[PDB]
């Protein structure tokens, strides 16, 4: 399995960044997808999860209203759009495949077995 | 974060170390799915301890995980220079909550 | 009593010993999406004949009653008659004795029909 | 000394799974309508639906580990596919549609595209130029005017549901063969899991209307006594909250546009029913819900939810987070064409301690790919005249939002999408069991030599 | 002895009579390309019923052992008991009697059950 | 095996519109090749029935046969028989 | 199609060679010889077997 992401992006404060994570080597419509955010030098932060079957999404409280997660099951690509970008959003973003299927043997949260290469978004008021 | 980890732990090669993940009674103690990810500097993390004690594939038996009340613990046996990376705790706190992260250093200056 | 199919399910084994004629009669029930009914009515008759073969290879050859010469092993839940026929129902009974049914059937068929049938044959051969 | 005795036909059942057949009512048998979607060769139901009751019986039910819902889902999908296959294929409809906005004034929103295209006629030599009125959710622009093409002309092979069939959910009784029985839990308070006090036996279930809907359980069965909140894992928020109402909430959904049907011939013996010019006023579909009834129903639901989470807490509602059009909105079929009402005005309230109707915008989408069957999409033909249907909301498929370091106001948002929950609302009180009529038992009897 | 299915096929007939129980239970064994097993397990149930019906239409009504009042005709390979029950096997037995097996069934079902059941019916007529 | 083979091809893709006049040229190679690699370019019907697509492929010599400017080829068994692509998911 | 894809061979990346199948000449010689020793049984006491 492989999760290939886009390249590093340079966005001004107040813009909207759209990152893409393409999956390869498994059934696309049977595994959840977590979106993880990490500021360089800080801890790990979670944003939301996508269920590719009908694309049922659930965001984190810190980014509910800003973040929008969708997917294209034809190309098998998850898309994450982030609006109202601030200087804090300068960070690396990862797409994490769930360890197991969400439909089967999944009551509780567990597993981020596969990750992406990570995309670094740079938000600074400089020109 | 919802969890509190040591800022940085250290150990001698070949020994055993215990990293503590301190959470409340509704996140770590209330469920049994504290996991441990291995994040190398500048790379994507890797799940090395899923469930609460079990480990996923690709990870040897050098890692173990236990839970006492609301305090989880990751024990590393036979430390090696390859383990000089970050190790993050993870718990289901009515959602997704991660530990503050702990920098591991073996056979090296602080 | 005739309380319908499985009517005496929760009743004691002593009382459920008279409803056996009911839960037997309802054991046989007299394209696409129509393969279901055919496969189901084949599985039903196959299961019924499996149970009937198990019953025939025992010293019963008949329904609703049976006896034999195999003794009740003291290890298999040693109790009394009222302690089983009046203190429990068939559900709790098979639940607590869902251990030995296979070996019990094996002994029932082997030690009896391979011995008592040949015994009858040799006592009639004279 | 005791001896073993064999009893044949003992009241003994064991959990198992088997191919359950059907049984339809013979009242709608005169409504053949050329092989109605579901019931074609469904054997007649029981004229006397004998349902035997039991006592001193307890069974560990489980509506989430039930294998009847899986059989029902697979049978519904297979029946849908087998009813779609003999219809007309719409593979030549994938052409560059020269689309303009419908003949209207400003303040239109699209949502009604007059599209002209070169369609093949009967004779393979000659060609034909025909027009239709699609919906914006059904077409997508390819990039002089604006050229469009059907939404499922790049990832799936579109098929037109031959209109001789219908989509009316007909009562389907999933019945078990001989040697199997179905256990009905006829008690009032039953969360789904654990032992059931009142376990009765039956040949099979009641009339089940296989309604395919999201965020709202239309034309469903009501709850035993009061509103019941059923979820697999209370702590899990992803678990779809299955609410069962006691009072059915009336909902009147109307497609007011008077559509005319044009029968364009795409091939020899191949027809194509398209939307002609809309004769009359150009309005949009809507679903009225009496605001007072919906309010008091939401009040009952929050009163019951205040039992599973704390003594007293704040419950908040909001419109769906995101995803495909079939989840962010409430999807259902009214008169043969499926459409989606966004239902933002139905989940807005907030409860802490203590005559009109609400109108929701409904968008229509004729090209359908329900059940996410990638590679096989359906085309819903238009329906002549105004469409009207008065349904009863009897359930809610909600989902709890994630918590926080401290959570005093839990928010619930509509959801679902997976149609297994629509069946778990009916197959929750049922379970199939196989009979083990062989029983060994000790007694004083002993056969002779 | 329990030597598995067809365990004592090559053993003597006298010893092969003590292994009929393992082969009496195994005679029932509890889209496209699935039609194979569905058309086979409908042949298995229809085949076993054919032998059970014959075992019922005859004066046996019993499993693994049956004795009838039809006298053994000398024309059916007249031998002795020791020359057959110990010097031959069930494999070799039918290979030489595969001439009258269809008519042997005849006099064994007609002259027996249509007579001894009617004689039993008139015996209880009083 | 034969009946089980056809039931694995019927749900796969059909290539009846595939074999059009193929402008096959030899792949980029030097002398002493043997052929065995035909770079064929052909018109193919895209998703839209109206528009067409000019796409190429690399067929083998045993798959194409010249029908009779450069040489033009077509699939070998695209007379005679309806070619069917074994859908590669299996 | 719509939604029907002819998987075709794109440009061959790398060096252009042809397929082959290797077989240990030590084993294959010995294997065929073991067959001749058995095949000579069915045709004379000693005859010339040619492959
Ligand atoms: C919940 O239960 C409601 C009560 O049954 C039900 O409402 C009725 O739904 C039917 C259709 O589902 C409505 O009937 C339509 O009436 C028009 C006018 O005559 C017919 O043209 C139409 O037939 C269509 O014909 C097409 C061509 O043959 C065919 O392709 C279509 O499939 C279809 O058969 C229908 O007969 C009826 O008026 C509604 N009654 C009212 C007032 O409630 C709801 O739809 C149902 N909801 C769900 C989610 O199923
Ligand atoms: C079959 O046709 C359907 C209908 O067109 C089609 O669905 C659409 O596909 C497109 C792409 O194939 C989707 O568009 C994407 O949407 C996301 C939304 O977040 C965008 O991020 C994508 O790229 C934009 O952003 C990038 C930044 O990361 C830019 O680099 C890029 O230039 C874009 O600005 C892209 O627009 C679209 O959402 C779907 N949805 C619809 C309208 O149905 C389907 O994919 C087709 N399938 C195939 C491949 O046959
Ligand atoms: C579909 O296409 C295939 C491939 O083209 C085709 O099979 C071939 O058909 C041709 C005939 O159309 C066959 O050609 C013959 O081959 C033999 C052996 O090499 C030659 O001897 C023949 O030469 C002549 O022989 C006779 C001389 O007196 C006469 O009969 C006549 O003059 C002949 O020209 C001739 O070339 C070819 O062998 C097959 N084989 C291949 C390559 O597949 C197939 O028939 C087509 N199906 C159809 C047309 O429905
Ligand atoms: C969608 O587009 C088509 C194509 O333009 C429209 O069809 C055409 O509409 C015009 C306007 O009504 C028709 O013209 C007039 O129609 C009346 C009908 O009684 C006739 O008496 C007049 O002599 C005149 O022809 C036209 O005939 C009609 N047909 C075509 C294909 O040209 C269609 O109305 C549009 N639909 C909507 C609602 O936008
Ligand atoms: C839940 O409710 C929100 C709020 O209504 C819905 O989203 C919002 O919908 C409005 C109306 O369509 C959008 O307003 C319009 O936005 C465009 C730009 O996108 C602008 O040009 C128009 O002038 C107008 O302001 C609004 O942007 C949109 N989003 C937000 C952030 O408010 C949402 O879709 C609802 N969800 C469901 C499932 O119904
Ligand atoms: C067989 O013939 C085809 C068609 O000529 C060859 O494919 C084509 O090869 C050329 C290069 O020789 C490609 O051109 C380049 O494409 C890239 C695409 O990003 C573009 O950036 C360059 O400017 C340039 O145009 C061309 O795209 C490619 N395909 C097509 C449809 O023409 C093929 O390589 C030949 N076989 C072999 C094995 O060489
Ligand atoms: C499925 O839902 C279950 C709901 O009961 C959940 O188990 C329960 O989780 C709560 C916390 O949310 C535990 O509560 C407290 O239990 C002891 C008390 O000392 C300590 O672990 C903590 O203080 C904890 O908060 C329940 O004990 C626990 N179990 C029961 C029987 O209620 C499950 O974890 C959920 N998921 C799974 C995998 O089943
Ligand atoms: C679904 O429809 C409702 C209709 O009320 C939308 O709700 C509001 O609609 C008005 C229309 O002028 C907007 O101004 C508001 O912003 C909408 N939202 C709120 C919170 O009042 C609702 O947004 C629609 N959902 C969509 C568009 O997906
Ligand atoms: C696709 O169709 C076009 C139709 O014009 C073909 O174009 C002609 O091809 C011939 C042979 O190479 C040339 O002599 C003509 O000059 C071309 N016409 C034009 C207008 O370009 C084209 O060759 C076809 N492609 C294939 C390989 O099938
Ligand atoms: C097929 O031929 C028709 C001819 O009518 C093309 O339609 C053209 O003419 C229509 C009548 O005025 C216009 O409404 C169309 O916009 C116009 N199309 C063009 C070329 O601009 C039609 O486009 C042709 N092919 C298709 C299906 O695109
Ligand atoms: C329960 O027990 C009563 C007697 O106490 C009996 O009459 C009744 O039939 C029992 N229920 C069942 C289902 O057997
Ligand atoms: C009785 O049980 C013992 C084990 O407790 C077993 O060894 C013995 O064979 C059993 N006897 C019978 C009659 O099965
Ligand atoms: C039978 O009893 C033994 C001992 O308690 C137990 O280990 C075994 O699982 C039982 N088998 C069953 C219940 O089938
Ligand atoms: C009206 O239709 C035209 C034709 O496609 C389109 O370009 C335009 O945006 C539409 N306007 C709306 C949104 O009503
Ligand atoms: C229902 O009750 C049972 C028994 O207490 C419990 O195990 C289960 O988690 C509850 N959940 C539901 C389905 O509401
Ligand atoms: C819908 O219409 C019926 C009459 O057909 C009426 O009884 C009912 O109250 C209406 N429901 C709503 C939501 O207004
Ligand atoms: C529902 O009724 C209560 C009581 O009057 C009121 O406080 C509340 O605002 C109402 N909510 C809605 C949605 O009208
Ligand atoms: C939702 O509620 C707010 C008030 O809290 C109101 O302003 C808004 O209009 C409501 N939503 C809709 C669908 O109109
Ligand atoms: C609500 O309407 C549906 C329409 O199909 C009907 O089946 C249902 O019985 C109605 N509600 C009640 C409780 O009668
Ligand atoms: C062969 O004959 C011997 C005689 O003692 C018997 O024991 C054996 O079972 C026979 N072979 C088989 C397996 O039938
Ligand atoms: C015995 O054989 C003779 C000669 O075939 C025949 O006539 C006679 O009917 C036979 N008897 C029996 C019992 O079949
Ligand atoms: C029975 O024996 C006769 C000779 O007496 C022979 O012709 C006939 O074919 C035999 N039938 C069989 C072997 O079934
Ligand atoms: C080119 O094609 C012809 C005809 O198929 C073939 O004979 C030749 O070997 C190919 N290659 C070269 C190098 O000419
Ligand atoms: C095939 O490759 C393996 C691995 O290198 C080697 O051991 C074996 O001998 C090879 N076989 C042949 C036929 O050369
Ligand atoms: C082939 O190998 C066998 C076994 O080593 C040997 O006897 C024989 O002479 C060899 N043949 C040749 C031609 O070398």
Author numbering:
A (entry chain G): 2 to 52, 52A, 53 to 82, 82A, 82B, 82C, 83 to 100, 100A, ...
B (entry chain J): 2 to 9, 11 to 27, 27A, 27B, 27C, 28 to 94, 96 to 110
C (entry chain D), E (entry chain E): 518 to 547, 569 to 664
D (entry chain A): 33 to 141, 152 to 185, 187 to 309, 312 to 321, 321A, 322 to 398, 411 to 505
F (entry chain B): 108 to 141, 152 to 185, 187 to 208
G (entry chain B): 312 to 321, 321A, 322 to 361
Original paper wording:
The binding site for CD4 (CD4bs), the HIV-1 host receptor, is an attractive target for HIV-1 immunogen design because bNAbs that recognize this epitope are among the most potent and broad. The IOMA class of CD4bs bNAbs includes fewer rare features and somatic hypermutations (SHMs) to achieve broad neutralization, thus presenting a potentially accessible pathway for vaccine-induced bNAb development. Impacts on neutralization for each variant were evaluated, and this information was used to design minimally mutated IOMA-class variants (IOMAmin) that incorporated the fewest SHMs required for achieving IOMA’s neutralization breadth.
We designed three variants based on the following neutralization criteria: IOMAmin3 included inFACE mutations with IC50 values within 2-fold of IOMA against all four strains (four green boxes), IOMAmin4 included inFACE mutations with IC50 values within 2-fold of IOMA against at least three strains (at least three green boxes), and IOMAmin5 included inFACE mutations with IC50 values within 2-fold of IOMA against all four strains (four green boxes) in VH and only exFACE mutations in VL. Class I (3.9 Å resolution) revealed density for three IOMAmin5 and three 10-1074 Fabs bound to BG505, while class II (4.2 Å) displayed density for only two IOMAmin5 and three 10-1074 Fabs bound to BG505. Analysis of a 3.9 Å single-particle cryoelectron microscopy (cryo-EM) structure of an IOMAmin variant bound to Env showed that, despite containing fewer SHMs, the structural interactions between the IOMAmin variant and Env resembled those observed in the previously characterized structure of mature IOMA bound to Env,8 validating our hypothesis that not all IOMA SHMs contribute to its ability to recognize and neutralize HIV-1. Notably, despite the approximate C3 symmetry in the class I structure, asymmetry was evident in the IOMAmin5 VH CDRH3 as each of the three IOMAmin5 CDRH3 regions adopted distinct disordered loops. By contrast, the mature version of IOMA’s CDRH3, although also disordered, extends toward the CD4bs,8 unlike the CDRH3 loops observed for IOMAmin5. The observation that IOMAmin5 adopts an identical CDRL1 conformation to that of mature IOMA suggests that sequence differences between IOMA and IOMAmin5 that are outside of CDRL1 (the CDRL1 sequences are identical) do not influence the CDRL1 conformation. IOMAmin5 and IOMA buried comparable surface areas on BG505 gp120 (1,020 and 1,000 Å2, respectively); however, the distribution of buried surface area (BSA) on gp120 varied for IOMAmin5 and IOMA. Unlike IOMA, IOMAmin5 showed no BSA in the gp120 inner domain, which includes the highly conserved K97gp120.18 Moreover, IOMA exhibited more than double the BSA in the gp120 exit loop compared to IOMAmin5, which had more concentrated BSA in the D and CD4 binding loops. A comparison of the paratopes of IOMAmin5 and IOMA revealed that residues engaged with the gp120 CD4bs were largely similar.
